[PDB]
Structure formats: structure tokens, C-alpha cells
Design an enzyme around this catalytic site. Structure first.
Site, mmCIF file in Angstrom:
data_model
loop_
_atom_site.group_PDB
_atom_site.id
_atom_site.type_symbol
_atom_site.label_atom_id
_atom_site.label_comp_id
_atom_site.label_asym_id
_atom_site.label_seq_id
_atom_site.Cartn_x
_atom_site.Cartn_y
_atom_site.Cartn_z
ATOM 1 N N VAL A 77 0.831 -1.197 0.000
ATOM 2 C CA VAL A 77 0.000 0.000 0.000
ATOM 3 C C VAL A 77 0.872 1.255 0.000
ATOM 4 C CG1 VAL A 77 -1.804 1.268 1.248
ATOM 5 C CG2 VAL A 77 -1.815 -1.230 1.237
ATOM 6 N N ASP A 78 1.943 1.226 0.790
ATOM 7 C CA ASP A 78 2.866 2.350 0.881
ATOM 8 C C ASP A 78 3.861 2.355 -0.277
ATOM 9 O OD1 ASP A 78 2.189 3.789 3.406
ATOM 10 O OD2 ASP A 78 2.530 1.801 4.273
ATOM 11 N N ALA A 79 3.873 1.287 -1.059
ATOM 12 C CA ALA A 79 4.766 1.214 -2.198
ATOM 13 C C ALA A 79 4.368 2.260 -3.234
ATOM 14 C CB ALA A 79 4.745 -0.178 -2.807
#
Length: 79
Positions: A60-62
């Protein structure tokens, strides 16, 4: 336009990171709770706990990590 695309980009990273942080947080917690619940519900998925934690948060934070990363990779490093 350099100072604008420079500050706008950095600043965009702040907004992007924040907005993405909110949405990312929401979903991570969404699927995180369910997945974490099951895995954490099954003593055999303890390693899944941590693995899933990093995977869900990281995947998701990628997105902002890729946008921000690419931006600064060329900006702060290549510029």
C-alpha cells in the site's frame, strides 16, 4: 518553472504522502484486520502476522514510495 516544479513536487509528496497515508492507513487496517485476524487466529500463521504486516503496509505504501521515491531519486539525487 524549476522552483515551482521543485517546491510543488516536494510539497506534492507531503500532500500525496498524507492523502496516501490516510487512504493507505484505512485499507491496511481494513484488510490488515481481517487478514491479521485470521492469521493471528491460527497459531500457525504467527510469522504471517509480521509478514502480512509489512506486505500489506509496504504494498500500500509502495505507491507513495514509488511516486516519492522516483521523484526524489531524480530530484534530490539526480537534481
Amino acid at each position: 518553472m524549476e522552483n515551482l516544479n521543485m517546491d510543488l513536487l516536494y510539497m506534492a509528496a507531503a500532500v500525496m504522502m498524507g492523502l496516501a497515508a490516510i487512504g493507505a492507513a484505512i485499507g491496511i487496517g481494513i484488510l490488515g484486520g481481517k487478514f491479521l485476524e485470521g492469521a493471528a487466529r491460527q497459531p500457525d500463521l504467527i510469522p504471517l502476522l509480521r509478514t502480512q504486516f509489512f506486505i500489506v503496509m509496504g504494498l500500500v505504501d509502495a505507491i507513495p514510495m514509488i511516486a516519492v521515491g522516483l521523484g526524489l531519486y531524480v530530484m534530490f539525487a539526480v537534481a
